[PDB]
Amino acid sequence: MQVWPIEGIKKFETLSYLPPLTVEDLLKQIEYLLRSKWVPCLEFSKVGFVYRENHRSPGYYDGRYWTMWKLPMFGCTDATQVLKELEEAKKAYPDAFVRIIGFDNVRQVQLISFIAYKPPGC
Amino acid sequence: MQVWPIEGIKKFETLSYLPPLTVEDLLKQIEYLLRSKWVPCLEFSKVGFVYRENHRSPGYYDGRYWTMWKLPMFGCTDATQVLKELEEAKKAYPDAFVRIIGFDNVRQVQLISFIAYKPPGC
Amino acid sequence: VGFKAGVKDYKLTYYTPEYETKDTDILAAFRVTPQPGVPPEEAGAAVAAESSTGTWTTVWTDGLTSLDRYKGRCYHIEPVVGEDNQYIAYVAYPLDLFEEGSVTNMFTSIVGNVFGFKALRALRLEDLRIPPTYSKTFQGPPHGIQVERDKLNKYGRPLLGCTIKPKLGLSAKNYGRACYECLRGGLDFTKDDENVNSQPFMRWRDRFVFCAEAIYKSQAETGEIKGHYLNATAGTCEEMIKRAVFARELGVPIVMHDYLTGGFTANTSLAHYCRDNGLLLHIHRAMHAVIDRQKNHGMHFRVLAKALRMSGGDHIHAGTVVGKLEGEREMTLGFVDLLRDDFIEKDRARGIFFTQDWVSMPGVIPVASGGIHVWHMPALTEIFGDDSVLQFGGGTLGHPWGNAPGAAANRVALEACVQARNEGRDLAREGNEIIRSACKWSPELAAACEIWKAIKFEFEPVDKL
Amino acid sequence: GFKAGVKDYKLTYYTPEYETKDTDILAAFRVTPQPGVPPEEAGAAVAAESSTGTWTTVWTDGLTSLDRYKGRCYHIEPVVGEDNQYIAYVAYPLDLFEEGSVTNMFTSIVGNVFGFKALRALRLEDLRIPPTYSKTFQGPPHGIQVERDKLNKYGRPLLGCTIKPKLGLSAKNYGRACYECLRGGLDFTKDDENVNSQPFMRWRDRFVFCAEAIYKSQAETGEIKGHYLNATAGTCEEMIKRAVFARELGVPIVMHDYLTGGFTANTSLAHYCRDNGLLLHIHRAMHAVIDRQKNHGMHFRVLAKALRMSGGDHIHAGTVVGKLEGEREMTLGFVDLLRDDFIEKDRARGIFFTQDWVSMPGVIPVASGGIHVWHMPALTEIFGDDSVLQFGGGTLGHPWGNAPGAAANRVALEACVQARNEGRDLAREGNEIIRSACKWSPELAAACEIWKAIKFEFEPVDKL
Amino acid sequence: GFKAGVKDYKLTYYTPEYETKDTDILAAFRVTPQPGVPPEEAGAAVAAESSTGTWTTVWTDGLTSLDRYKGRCYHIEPVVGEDNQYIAYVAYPLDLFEEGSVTNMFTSIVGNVFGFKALRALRLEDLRIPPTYSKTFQGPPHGIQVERDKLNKYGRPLLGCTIKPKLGLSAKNYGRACYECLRGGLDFTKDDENVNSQPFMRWRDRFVFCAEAIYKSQAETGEIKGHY
Amino acid sequence: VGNVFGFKALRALRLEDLRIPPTYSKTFQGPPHGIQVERDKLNKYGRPLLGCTIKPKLGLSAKNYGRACYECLRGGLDFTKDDENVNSQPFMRWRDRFVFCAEAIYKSQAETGEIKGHY
Amino acid sequence: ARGIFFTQDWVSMPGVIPVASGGIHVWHMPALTEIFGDDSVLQFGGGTLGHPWGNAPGAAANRVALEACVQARNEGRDLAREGNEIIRSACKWSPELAAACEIWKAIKFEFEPVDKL
Numbered sequence A, B: 001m002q003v004w005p006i007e008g009i010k011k012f013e014t015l016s017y018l019p020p021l022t023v024e025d026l027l028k029q030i031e032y033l034l035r036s037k038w039v040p041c042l043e044f045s046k047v048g049f050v051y052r053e054n055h056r057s058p059g060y061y062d063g064r065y066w067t068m069w070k071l072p073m074f075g076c077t078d079a080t081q082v083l084k085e086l087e088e089a090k091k092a093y094p095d096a097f098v099r100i101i102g103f104d105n106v107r108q109v110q111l112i113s114f115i116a117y118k119p120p121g122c
Numbered sequence C: 001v002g003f004k005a006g007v008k009d010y011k012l013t014y015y016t017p018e019y020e021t022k023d024t025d026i027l028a029a030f031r032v033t034p035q036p037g038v039p040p041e042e043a044g045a046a047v048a049a050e051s052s053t054g055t056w057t058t059v060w061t062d063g064l065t066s067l068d069r070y071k072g073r074c075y076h077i078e079p080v081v082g083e084d085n086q087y088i089a090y091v092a093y094p095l096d097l098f099e100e101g102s103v104t105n106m107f108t109s110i111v112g113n114v115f116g117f118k119a120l121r122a123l124r125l126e127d128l129r130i131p132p133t134y135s136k137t138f139q140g141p142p143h144g145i146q147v148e149r150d151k152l153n154k155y156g157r158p159l160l161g162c163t164i165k166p167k168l169g170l171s172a173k174n175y176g177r178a179c180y181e182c183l184r185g186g187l188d189f190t191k192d193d194e195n196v197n198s199q200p201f202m203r204w205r206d207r208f209v210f211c212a213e214a215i216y217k218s219q220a221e222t223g224e225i226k227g228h229y230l231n232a233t234a235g236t237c238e239e240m241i242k243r244a245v246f247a248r249e250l251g252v253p254i255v256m257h258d259y260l261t262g263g264f265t266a267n268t269s270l271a272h273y274c275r276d277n278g279l280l281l282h283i284h285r286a287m288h289a290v291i292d293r294q295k296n297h298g299m300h301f302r303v304l305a306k307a308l309r310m311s312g313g314d315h316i317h318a319g320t321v322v323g324k325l326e327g328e329r330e331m332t333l334g335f336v337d338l339l340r341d342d343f344i345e346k347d348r349a350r351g352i353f354f355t356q357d358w359v360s361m362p363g364v365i366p367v368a369s370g371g372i373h374v375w376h377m378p379a380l381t382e383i384f385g386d387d388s389v390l391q392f393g394g395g396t397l398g399h400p401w402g403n404a405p406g407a408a409a410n411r412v413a414l415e416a417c418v419q420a421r422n423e424g425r426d427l428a429r430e431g432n433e434i435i436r437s438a439c440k441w442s443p444e445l446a447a448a449c450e451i452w453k454a455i456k457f458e459f460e461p462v463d464k465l
Numbered sequence D: 001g002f003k004a005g006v007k008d009y010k011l012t013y014y015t016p017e018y019e020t021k022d023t024d025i026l027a028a029f030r031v032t033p034q035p036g037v038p039p040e041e042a043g044a045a046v047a048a049e050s051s052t053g054t055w056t057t058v059w060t061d062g063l064t065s066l067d068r069y070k071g072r073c074y075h076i077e078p079v080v081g082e083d084n085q086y087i088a089y090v091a092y093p094l095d096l097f098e099e100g101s102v103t104n105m106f107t108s109i110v111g112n113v114f115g116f117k118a119l120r121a122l123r124l125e126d127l128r129i130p131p132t133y134s135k136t137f138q139g140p141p142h143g144i145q146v147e148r149d150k151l152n153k154y155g156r157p158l159l160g161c162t163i164k165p166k167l168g169l170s171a172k173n174y175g176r177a178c179y180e181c182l183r184g185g186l187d188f189t190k191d192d193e194n195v196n197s198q199p200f201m202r203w204r205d206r207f208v209f210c211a212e213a214i215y216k217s218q219a220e221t222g223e224i225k226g227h228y229l230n231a232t233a234g235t236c237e238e239m240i241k242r243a244v245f246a247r248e249l250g251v252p253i254v255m256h257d258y259l260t261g262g263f264t265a266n267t268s269l270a271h272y273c274r275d276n277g278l279l280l281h282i283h284r285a286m287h288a289v290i291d292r293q294k295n296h297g298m299h300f301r302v303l304a305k306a307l308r309m310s311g312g313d314h315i316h317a318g319t320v321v322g323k324l325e326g327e328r329e330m331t332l333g334f335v336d337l338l339r340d341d342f343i344e345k346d347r348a349r350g351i352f353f354t355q356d357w358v359s360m361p362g363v364i365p366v367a368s369g370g371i372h373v374w375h376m377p378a379l380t381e382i383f384g385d386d387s388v389l390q391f392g393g394g395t396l397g398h399p400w401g402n403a404p405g406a407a408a409n410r411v412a413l414e415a416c417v418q419a420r421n422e423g424r425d426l427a428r429e430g431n432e433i434i435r436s437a438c439k440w441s442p443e444l445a446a447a448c449e450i451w452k453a454i455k456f457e458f459e460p461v462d463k464l
Numbered sequence E: 001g002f003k004a005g006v007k008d009y010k011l012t013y014y015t016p017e018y019e020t021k022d023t024d025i026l027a028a029f030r031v032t033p034q035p036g037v038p039p040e041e042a043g044a045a046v047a048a049e050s051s052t053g054t055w056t057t058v059w060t061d062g063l064t065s066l067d068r069y070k071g072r073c074y075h076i077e078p079v080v081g082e083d084n085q086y087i088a089y090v091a092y093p094l095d096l097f098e099e100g101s102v103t104n105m106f107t108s109i110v111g112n113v114f115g116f117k118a119l120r121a122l123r124l125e126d127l128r129i130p131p132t133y134s135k136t137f138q139g140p141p142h143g144i145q146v147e148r149d150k151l152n153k154y155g156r157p158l159l160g161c162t163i164k165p166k167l168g169l170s171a172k173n174y175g176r177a178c179y180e181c182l183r184g185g186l187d188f189t190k191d192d193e194n195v196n197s198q199p200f201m202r203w204r205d206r207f208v209f210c211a212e213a214i215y216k217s218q219a220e221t222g223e224i225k226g227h228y
Numbered sequence F: 001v002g003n004v005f006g007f008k009a010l011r012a013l014r015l016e017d018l019r020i021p022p023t024y025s026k027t028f029q030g031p032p033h034g035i036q037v038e039r040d041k042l043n044k045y046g047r048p049l050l051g052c053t054i055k056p057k058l059g060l061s062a063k064n065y066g067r068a069c070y071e072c073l074r075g076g077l078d079f080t081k082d083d084e085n086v087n088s089q090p091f092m093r094w095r096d097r098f099v100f101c102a103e104a105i106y107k108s109q110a111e112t113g114e115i116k117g118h119y
Numbered sequence G: 001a002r003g004i005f006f007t008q009d010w011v012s013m014p015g016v017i018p019v020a021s022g023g024i025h026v027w028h029m030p031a032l033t034e035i036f037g038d039d040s041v042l043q044f045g046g047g048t049l050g051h052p053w054g055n056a057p058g059a060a061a062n063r064v065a066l067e068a069c070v071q072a073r074n075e076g077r078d079l080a081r082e083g084n085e086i087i088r089s090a091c092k093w094s095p096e097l098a099a100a101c102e103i104w105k106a107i108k109f110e111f112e113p114v115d116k117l
C-alpha cells in the first residue's frame, strides 16, 4: 500500500500526471493540434497556480490568466516553428512556466493546453 | 506565583498538557483503543494547527483535516502493528506531525485522538 | 344517548384501567397526593380529564366529536412505596392532542391547569414517554454531540469550560481580559454567566466585540479551537435574534440561551436560527430548581431535559453530583442517558418510568458545573465520561495565581484522569492518587490542590428515588 | 490583597445594617436551611449566588466594586409556627438588571439558588419592583380603562367562556359554539389554553370561522363581541404569524399562555399588540407547577407582577370559590397588585412590600374555572366590576344549550349589579338576589336547578 | 479487514430473516430480472442501489454502520401466472429519508434502480409510509372536512367542469364559459391542466375575468362557487 | 404528455422525440453557463473532466463526507459529489456537509494547485 | 439510425456536458474517452473509493488512466482497438493504476439492452 504524496507534486492540468514530456512528446501534441486545424499559442507566468486574492465569489479565481507570448500562430503549419518559439520564450524567461495551448475559433474554446517548460526547481 | 508561558507551548488537543508520551505510553493508548473495539487510523500534516483562510462563518475553520496515512486499520488486533505503521509514517514524512485516532463506526465518531510524533523543532 | 346536564365524577369517563396504550400516545407518570376523601381513581381521572378534553360539568358539545378518540385517560394507578396517600397515576394522551414541534403546547396541556386543582394537595410530573411519531416533528439539537466534536476537532476527553466571575459587575473589556486569560491556559470554553445579558455595567455588543477578540487571541496563541458562549438571552425575541446575528457576523462558534427564563417559544426559534447559521447552542437551565427540586410537587428535571432535547440545544447543564447544587447520583445518570442516548429502557432504579426511543434525534452534551474543583476531576470523569463539558468558574478564577494558571491546573487534572483511565486505572478508587501524581508535573495543579483540599459539599439530597 | 480559598458567604453578603435604596429590587424569600446551616449563611448564599458571588474567592472581584453591585441579605426573621423556616430579605442594586427584561430579572433572582445543596427548600414570596425599573417596561398593551373604552363596556364585570371539550372540536364547530355563546349575552368566548394548531383543528381555519362568529353575534345583538384567538405557538415566528392574521381579520382580542410560551415571546407579543391595537388576554397555564406549595417555588403574586411588567391586558387570577385553589385574602392582595397604582405593604394579604406602579396601566383579573350562576354574587363581591368572569362548563353545560346558558350568566350578573348598586349586600343576600331573578328568567332558573348542589370546598394548600 | 473488489449484492442486501420495524419505509417492487440473474440477486441489487451500496466494495462502509442504514430485500415471491416476475419487498430505515421531502423519498427508492442492466423491468407497486415519517409532512392544506365546512357543502359529491376547448379561448371567453356553467348548478369550473399563461390568454387576465364570473354566479344562485 | 397516455383506446404510448423550434427555445435561459464557459471558469482544457460520487450512498457523517472528498480530490479528480439522495437527513444535515466539503475543496485545491469542486 | 426523428436547431443555446457514471472503472477509460470525447465528465464512485489503497490512490489511478488515454489518442492511437494495451502501458508508471487494474480486470457488465432502435 502506497500513500499518495502531499508535497512536491503540484499539478498543471492535462498531462501532468504522466512522466515528464520529452521533446518528441511535445512535438506529437503540437502535430495533433495542427492536424486538427487548431491555432497554437504560447503563454507564460512566474506564478504557476490559481489563488483567490480579489474575490471569493463562485467562479472567481485569480491566476487563471497567464501572459501571452507574442500572438497566436495563425496560419502555422509546422510544429517545428512552435518549438522554436518555445525555445525563444524559455531563453527570454527562464524562470517562468510556459504552456502551449491550441484553440478552435469556430467553437471558440481551447481544445488543448499543456505545460511545455517549468523553471529549475519547479 | 508562576506566569503561564505565552510562546513555545502550542498545543495539540488531548494529552498535550501532560509530559511527552513515551513509546510505552503510546502503546497503552493504542491498547485501550483496540480493547474498546475501535478502529485505529494514522493521519499526518506539515501544518499543525487550524487557521481561517477561506471563510470566517460560524463553525468554519481550515486545517481541521490532516492527510490519511493509508487506510484505517480495520480488523487490527495488535498494538505493535499500529506502532510499526507510525514508524513507517515518520520515516516517510519526518517533517510532519503524525496523530493516531480511533473511531467507533456505530456512533460514527472519533473516540480518541492524540499526537504521536512531532517533527524536530516543534 | 341524550345530553344530560350536570356534574358527574371524572372517573366515569377518564379512569380507564383496561386501556392498552398505543405506540403513538404520549404517556405521563404523575405523582399525585389527593385531598382527604378524594379516591385516587378520581384524582387520577381529574388530572387526565383536565389536561385533555374535560371540564367540571357535562357539556353537550362532547357529542359533536369523539371523546373516545381524543380523551386523555388514566390507565393505571399505583401506590407509592412508603406513602399513605401518594400514588403514581399513569395518563395516556392521544398524539392528535398535540401541536407538532411545540414543547410549549405539550406542557400547556399536560401541566397547564391540573396542578392547581382544589381536590389535590400536591402533584408532580415525573416522566413523559415521547413517542417517535411526535419527536420526529421537532428539529432537536442544532448540531448534537458528534457534529459538535467534529466542528471543534475535539476528541477523547470531556470538554472544559468556565463561567466568568464576579457574576455581574464586570465591564466588557474586563470580561474579554478574563476570557483570554482562561482560554489561553487550556480551557476549551468560557461563558457569560446566565444572568449576564445587557446591563448598565456592561452592554452586550461591547462584550461580544471584546470576547471575540479574546477568543481569537487565545486560539492563535494555543493553536486549539476556542469559544466563549455569548448569551443571547434577552427580554424580547427581536433582541435575542439581534444578539445571535451579531455573534454570527463575528464568526464565533457558540452562543448560549437560558431556555426556561427566556422560554420555549423563544428557545425553539433560537435553535432553528443556530441550525441555519452554524452556531453551537449551549443551554443554561436557570430557574429549573424552582420547579424540580421537591419530590412531592412540580416537574422532575428529566422531563425538562427531554423537553430541551426536543426544543433544541447542543449542550444542557445536568448537575455535578459532587458540587454545590443538588444532584442525586442515580437519577442524574438516568437523565444523562435520556439526553445523550438513542434508546433508554425503562429503569425505575434510575427514575426512568418509560422506555424512551429517540429515533436518531442527536444527543445533547451534558454540562457539569457549580462548585467543582480539581479534586473532583476523577469523580466527574467517572460519572459523565467523555461526552460532557466540565465547567470551573470559581475553580479557575479562584486559583491563587490567576486565570491562565487556574485553567492549566484544570486541563492537566483532566488529562491526567483521562490518561489513567485509558491505561486501566479505577477513577472511582484511585482518583486522589492520580491527581497527586500529576501535581509533580504541574506547579499550577499543586497550588489548586492545596487551596481546595478540604472543600467538599456533602448534604442529603431533597429528592431521592 | 487577593486571598484564594473558600470563606462563608455571610462575611460579604449578610449585611443586617444595610438601609435599602429606593432603586433597589427587594426580594422576600421563605428559606428552609439544611440542618447545621445557620439561617444568616443560608440567606447570604441566596443573596450571593443570585447577584455577584460564587463558592470560592475570585481575584476579579477586585477589578470592580462589590459594594456597588452585590445583592445583600439585610434582614432575616423566623417564621412563627414553622420549624426551621425564615423569611430572608435581599436587596439587589438596580444596575444588576437588564431594562425591560422580566427574563433577566428572574434569571438572577431565581436562576440557580433554589437548587443549592445547603438549602432544603426555598420560595420567593414577593418582589418590590422600584419605579426606576418598572418604567423601562411597556406593561399592558392597553390596560383597564382603555379596554373598556375600546369595547364601550362599563358598569359591570365582563363575561367570557372557554369553549369545550378542551380539545377535539373542529374549526367549524368551534365557530358554531362561539356564535351561540356570544349571541346569548357573553362579551367574549376563548380558545382553551391548549388549543393552538393541531390535527383536529388548524389555527388558521379556526381564526376564519371564529371571526365569522364574532361578527354575526355582534350584528345580531348590537354589542361589541370578541373571541380570544390563541397566538401561543412553538416558535416566535409562528406566534407572530397568528397575531398578524388576527390583525388582518380586524378582531379585538388575542390570547397568549405567557409561562408556557415564555417571557421573551410574551414581551414581543405585548409590543406587537400595542402597535396593532389588539387586546391581549393572558392565560397563566403551568403557574401552579411553581406556585402551589408554601415551602418551595414562587408565589403567584410575583408571577402576576411579572406579567403586568412583560405585558397583558387581562390575566387569570383565580375564583376563590371554583374548582382551582385560591385563598381569599391572598387573592385580594394580588388582585390589587394587578389593578392598582399603589399597594401598601399588608402582611394580612401577603403583600410583603409597598409596590408603586407609577401609572403603569392596570390588568383586568379574570376569574375562571368551575364557576356557575350561584357563584355570581360572591364573584361580584370579591372582584368588583374590573374583572372578567368566565363560564365554560357553566355556559356549554346549560341544559338548553349555549345561547340560553350565556343569557343565564348575563342575567345573573346584571341582577347582582343592579342589587349591589341599590345598596344590597351581595355577601348576605346573594342567594335571594339570584332566586328573585329566576322569577322572570327561565334560562337562569334552569341553570340554578342544575347546579344548586355544586360547591368546591377544600382546604387550600397555601395559607398566609 | 477491507477487501477490495466485487461481490454479489445478495451477500449484504438479501436478508430474508429480517423482521421489519414500525419505523421502516417498505416497498413492494415487481421485478423482472434478466435471464441468468437470480431473483435474490435482482432484489438485493434494487435494495442496495436505492440505499447504501454500489457496485464494488468501498472501505468507507467501515466508517459507518451498514447494519443501521442499509436497505434490505427481506422477502421475494414469484408472481403466479407471469414468467420470470417476482414481488421483492425492501425495507428502508427511517434515517435514510429527509423529513417532509417526497422528492428525497423518490430519489432513493426510484432514483437509479429502474435502469440497471441486470433487470429487464421494474415497477414500484406500493410503499408503506410509517407514521414516524408521514408526521413530518404538512399534508393537505385543508382536507375533506375543512373543505366542506368552508364551502358549506354537505350530503353529496361536489360537481365541477373543465372549460373547453382545452386551449385557444381568450380570457374574457373563459370567464363567460365559467359564469354560465356555475350559474346552472355546478360548484366549480376549472382551468384545463395545460391552461397556464399563453399568447391566446395570459393568466392575470384570466384570473380577473374568472373572479368576476365566480362572484356573479355566486350572487345569482346564492351558493358558494369556485373556479380552480 | 399530460393525459393522453391513460386513454382506454390505447394499449401503450411512448413519446420518442420532440422538434423544439428556435422560436420556442429562445424563450428559455438554458444552461446557466454551458460547456465553453465552464471550461473557461475552471481553466480545464484538453481532456474529459473526472468526478466521483462519495459512498456509501447514505449513512456517512458530514465530517467523514469532507474527509472522503478531500482524499479523492487531492489524488487527481476535478470533482466529487453528493450522491443524488444525499440531501439533509438525521445521519448528516446539509449545512454541516456544506461546511466540511468546502474545507475539503479548498484544502485539496491548495495542495494540488488545480481548481477543485464538490457538487 | 441514432433515434433522432427530427432535425434539431438550438440557435446558439449553450451545450450541456454529458456525464458518464455508474459501474465504471479504469479498464473502461479508453472506451469512455472514445465514445464521449473530451467534452464529458467521467465519474468513478466505487471506482475510486473501492481502490485497495484508498481514495487518493484511487483518484490517481483514474487520472493517470485518463491522461494516458488522451496522450495516446492525440498521438494517433486507436482507442477502440488498443485500449487495453494503453492502460497496461501506463501501469508501469503508476503502481496505483496497476492495483486498480488487478482488482477490476474481470469485471464487465454485458446484458442485452431493453430498448433497441
Ligand SMILES: O=C(O)[C@@](O)(COP(=O)(O)O)[C@H](O)[C@H](O)COP(=O)(O)O
Binding pocket: C163, C165, C167, C193, C194, C285, C286, C317, C318, C319, C320, C325, C367, C368, C369, C370, C371, C372, C391, C392, C393, C394, C395, D049, D054, D055, D112, D115
Ligand atoms: O452561576 C453559577 O453558579 C455557575 O456559573 C457556576 O459557577 P462556579 O463554576 O463558580 O460554581 C453555573 O451557572 C451553575 O453551575 C449553574 O447551575 P447548574 O449547572 O446546576 O444548572
Ligand SMILES: O=C(O)[C@@](O)(COP(=O)(O)O)[C@H](O)[C@H](O)COP(=O)(O)O
Binding pocket: C050, C055, C056, C113, C116, D162, D164, D166, D192, D193, D284, D285, D316, D317, D318, D319, D324, D366, D367, D368, D369, D370, D371, D390, D391, D392, D393, D394
Ligand atoms: O381549562 C379550563 O379549565 C378553563 O378553560 C376553565 O374551564 P371551565 O370554565 O369549564 O371551568 C380555564 O382555562 C381555567 O379557569 C384556568 O385556570 P385559572 O383561571 O385558575 O388559571
Ligand SMILES: O=C(O)[C@@](O)(COP(=O)(O)O)[C@H](O)[C@H](O)COP(=O)(O)O
Binding pocket: E049, E054, E055, E112, E115, F053, F055, F057, F083, F084, G019, G020, G021, G022, G023, G024, G043, G044, G045, G046, G047
Ligand atoms: O448512485 C450511483 O449509482 C452513482 O452515484 C454512481 O455510483 P458509482 O460511481 O459507485 O457506480 C450515480 O448517481 C449513477 O451513475 C447515476 O446513474 P446515471 O448516471 O445512469 O443517471
Ligand SMILES: [Mg+2]
Binding pocket: C163, C193, C194, C195
Ligand atoms: Mg452561572
Ligand SMILES: [Mg+2]
Binding pocket: D162, D192, D193, D194
Ligand atoms: Mg382552559
Ligand SMILES: [Mg+2]
Binding pocket: E162, E192, E193, E194
Ligand atoms: Mg384537463
Ligand SMILES: [Mg+2]
Binding pocket: F053, F083, F084, F085
Ligand atoms: Mg448516485
